[PDB]
Amino acid sequence: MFYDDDADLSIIQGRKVGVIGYGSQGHAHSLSLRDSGVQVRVGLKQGSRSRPKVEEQGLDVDTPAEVAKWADVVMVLAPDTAQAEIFAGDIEPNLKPGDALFFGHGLNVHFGLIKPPADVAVAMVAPKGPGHLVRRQFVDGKGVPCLVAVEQDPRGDGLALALSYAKAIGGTRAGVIKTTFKDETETDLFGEQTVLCGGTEELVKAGFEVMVEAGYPAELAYFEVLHELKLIVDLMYEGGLARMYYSVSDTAEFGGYLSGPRVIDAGTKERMRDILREIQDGSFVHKLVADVEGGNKQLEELRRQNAEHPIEVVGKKLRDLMSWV
Amino acid sequence: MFYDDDADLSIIQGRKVGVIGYGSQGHAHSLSLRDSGVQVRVGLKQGSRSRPKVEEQGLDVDTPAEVAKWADVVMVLAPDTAQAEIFAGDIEPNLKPGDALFFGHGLNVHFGLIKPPADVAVAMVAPKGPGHLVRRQFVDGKGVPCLVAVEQDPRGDGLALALSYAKAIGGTRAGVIKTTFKDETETDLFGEQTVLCGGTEELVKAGFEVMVEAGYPAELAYFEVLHELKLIVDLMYEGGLARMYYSVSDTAEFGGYLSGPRVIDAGTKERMRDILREIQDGSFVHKLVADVEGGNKQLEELRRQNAEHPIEVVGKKLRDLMSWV
Ligand SMILES: [Cl-]
Ligand SMILES: [Cl-]
Ligand SMILES: [Mg+2]
Ligand SMILES: [Mg+2]
Ligand SMILES: [Mg+2]
Ligand SMILES: [Mg+2]
Ligand SMILES: [Mg+2]
Ligand SMILES: [Mg+2]
Ligand SMILES: [Mg+2]
Ligand SMILES: [Mg+2]
Ligand SMILES: [Mg+2]
Ligand SMILES: [Mg+2]
Ligand SMILES: [Mg+2]
Ligand SMILES: [Mg+2]
Numbered sequence: 001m002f003y004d005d006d007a008d009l010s011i012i013q014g015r016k017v018g019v020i021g022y023g024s025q026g027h028a029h030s031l032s033l034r035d036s037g038v039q040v041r042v043g044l045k046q047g048s049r050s051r052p053k054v055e056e057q058g059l060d061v062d063t064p065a066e067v068a069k070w071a072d073v074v075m076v077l078a079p080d081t082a083q084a085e086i087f088a089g090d091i092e093p094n095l096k097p098g099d100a101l102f103f104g105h106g107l108n109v110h111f112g113l114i115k116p117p118a119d120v121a122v123a124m125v126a127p128k129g130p131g132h133l134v135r136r137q138f139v140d141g142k143g144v145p146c147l148v149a150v151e152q153d154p155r156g157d158g159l160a161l162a163l164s165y166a167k168a169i170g171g172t173r174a175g176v177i178k179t180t181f182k183d184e185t186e187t188d189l190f191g192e193q194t195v196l197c198g199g200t201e202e203l204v205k206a207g208f209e210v211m212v213e214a215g216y217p218a219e220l221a222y223f224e225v226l227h228e229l230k231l232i233v234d235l236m237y238e239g240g241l242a243r244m245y246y247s248v249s250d251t252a253e254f255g256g257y258l259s260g261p262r263v264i265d266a267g268t269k270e271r272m273r274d275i276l277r278e279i280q281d282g283s284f285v286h287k288l289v290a291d292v293e294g295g296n297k298q299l300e301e302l303r304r305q306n307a308e309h310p311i312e313v314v315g316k317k318l319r320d321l322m323s324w325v
Numbered sequence: 326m327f328y329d330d331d332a333d334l335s336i337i338q339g340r341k342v343g344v345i346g347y348g349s350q351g352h353a354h355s356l357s358l359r360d361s362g363v364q365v366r367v368g369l370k371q372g373s374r375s376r377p378k379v380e381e382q383g384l385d386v387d388t389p390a391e392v393a394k395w396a397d398v399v400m401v402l403a404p405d406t407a408q409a410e411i412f413a414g415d416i417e418p419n420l421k422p423g424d425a426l427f428f429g430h431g432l433n434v435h436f437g438l439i440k441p442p443a444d445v446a447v448a449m450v451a452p453k454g455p456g457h458l459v460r461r462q463f464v465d466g467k468g469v470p471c472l473v474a475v476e477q478d479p480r481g482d483g484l485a486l487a488l489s490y491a492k493a494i495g496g497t498r499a500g501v502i503k504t505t506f507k508d509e510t511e512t513d514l515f516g517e518q519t520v521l522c523g524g525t526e527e528l529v530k531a532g533f534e535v536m537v538e539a540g541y542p543a544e545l546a547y548f549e550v551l552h553e554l555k556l557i558v559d560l561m562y563e564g565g566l567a568r569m570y571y572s573v574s575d576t577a578e579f580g581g582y583l584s585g586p587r588v589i590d591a592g593t594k595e596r597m598r599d600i601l602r603e604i605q606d607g608s609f610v611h612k613l614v615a616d617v618e619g620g621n622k623q624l625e626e627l628r629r630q631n632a633e634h635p636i637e638v639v640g641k642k643l644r645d646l647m648s649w650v
């Protein structure tokens with residue numbers, strides 16, 4: 001791991017940094033880079049809803065093409081599925097030999113949606129927390145750990161430059177892990193699909209369905225598989241499985257140890273491996289890009305179905321009771 | 326549902342409430358009862374781990390039997406597996422005709438581990454949040470939704486008494502839902518086993534294993550299935566599936582919609598139905614009680630096995646980098 005003493009802040013301080021996009025990460029990076037003495041400009045199309053906010057924070061904003069021409073380091077933090085078009089239309093025609101093209105995730109480069117030219121460095125700085133936390137920790141003199149990767153390095157200083165950037169957003173205060181674009185994106189997609197945004201939600205829905213079908217009230221079903229999951233995951237986030245299991249009752253702990261491996265069995269793990277294979281072979285990403293090109297039809301259909309699940313109906317009613325939410 | 330105008334605080338204010346056991350919910354009951362003008366004493370053995378924090382709050386502490394003798398409402402917060410022995414020895418002979426026996430969960434009465442005498446009320450008040458939140462809401466003039474059940478009611482006033490108790494801890498400020506001991510405990514155990522403390526953890530572990538067996542770094546695996554789950558579950562807790570899916574990227578959302586139902590499917594639901602049957606038929610509880618009687622040997626063996634999982638090794642290392650946890 002790399003820490004503050006492994007990174008030289010004067011490197012990034014000597015580079016003009018363009019941040020393309022002003023979502024959570026673009027906001028956190030741009031403000032922290034500026035605080036660290038870096039000359040920053042934000043790249044947004046002229047009609048962007050974010051332009052007035054960038055300007056209110058005292059930052060200069062230009063189009064992505066203008067920022068790419070001006071900058072020595074172009075950090076791309078636009079939405080995943082929008083990056084290829086920004087690259088082809090705005091960034092690629094304006095890259096200069098010896099520029100560095102930075103990303104917050106490995107997807108676009110790894111899967112060939114963006115094919116950088118040979119005359120630029122290509123690197124990634126990926127903080128392991130939401131932008132609000134990246135910024136809050138930085139302002140308080142601390143940091144959020146980051147992943148860094150260097151995919152192309154024709155000037156030989158790509159890692160030093162990426163570590164300098166990480167230091168300028170606080171990442172080396174906590175620690176930086178070096179990885180690859182391939183590993184970052186394949187593990188990210190895999191975790192999203194099997195656990196974060198697929199598996200856990202389907203597990204909650206399935207438990208809810210079983211209870212309602214058995215004639216238990218939907219309100220109790222909501223509490224006992226969804227509402228109560230926040231405490232569990234908060235405990236794991238802070239102290240791992242050990243902390244959570246110590247905190248819950250012996251009845252919950254014993255029940256979890258016996259029933260968990262029945263719910264998630266060897267066959268479930270084999271299906272995970274199938275989902276990983278379809279990430280690794282490019283087929284999932286091909287399907288995603290095709291759906292985007294067609295107007296997000298399948299995404300929008302599946303979105304509506306999940307939004308209409310009965311857990312959503314009862315959950316809205318119960319969350320209306322909760323004055324801290 | 327029941328609200329403040331449905332409950333009469335003067336009822337519980339006229340009762341002597343003995344809280345037997347304490348644990349993480351103890352303050353949410355005992356401090357709010359006291360603030361609401363109720364006389365409270367806490368029954369704990371001399372060696373109890375809760376004694377220091379109870380004494381720090383200036384609550385009078387005595388043995389369970391002495392508190393039960395003094396009290397005319399006995400609220401049992403002790404661990405579910407310890408309640409039957411406390412009840413038989415310390416509570417039952419000290420329930421005078423017309424006393425009330427209260428619980429925060431339905432397990433012991435529903436499964437017959439505690440058989441109350443015929444001359445007492447038997448009721449449940451179950452706040453639906455962590456104790457710290459229930460108490461904080463109360464202090465701020467607000468509340469957390471509660472469940473209330475009345476299992477035995479010789480004087481005909483048990484619901485009024487339970488609602489008065491709920492009002493004194495803030496539950497009627499937010500809303501009280503009527504249920505039964507049976508439904509509270511069967512849904513609780515089912516959710517703990519299939520989702521909260523079994524299924525989600527085994528899903529996380531399986532995903533971690535798949536990544537590290539495929540050669541990806543354990544550090545990335547930890548982040549992508551465990552660390553990042555907190556943001557997801559926080560979003561669902563606040564706004565359901567819809568809010569979470571709106572807030573994650575298109576790639577994460579589309580991937581979850583496609584891969585989630587491949588990981589968790591109809592086969593999973595059938596296994597959940599078997600787990601539910603073993604809750605309903607008393608066999609899980611019988612196995613739990615027998616293990617407790619034998620010295621917790623199976624629980625301790627499974628606890629050790631889980632504590633040794635490789636996600637725990639890398640997780641401790643990475644959480645040490647995070648100052649905010
Ligand atoms: Cl973010
Ligand atoms: Cl409230
Ligand atoms: Mg304004
Ligand atoms: Mg302009
Ligand atoms: Mg220049
Ligand atoms: Mg991820
Ligand atoms: Mg992602
Ligand atoms: Mg324990
Ligand atoms: Mg005393
Ligand atoms: Mg008697
Ligand atoms: Mg009667
Ligand atoms: Mg529960
Ligand atoms: Mg429980
Ligand atoms: Mg379904």
Ligand SMILES: [Mg+2]
Pocket residue numbers: 436437606607
């Ligand atoms: Mg039985």
Ligand code: NA
Pocket residue numbers: 393394395396397398419420421424
């Ligand atoms: Na008594």
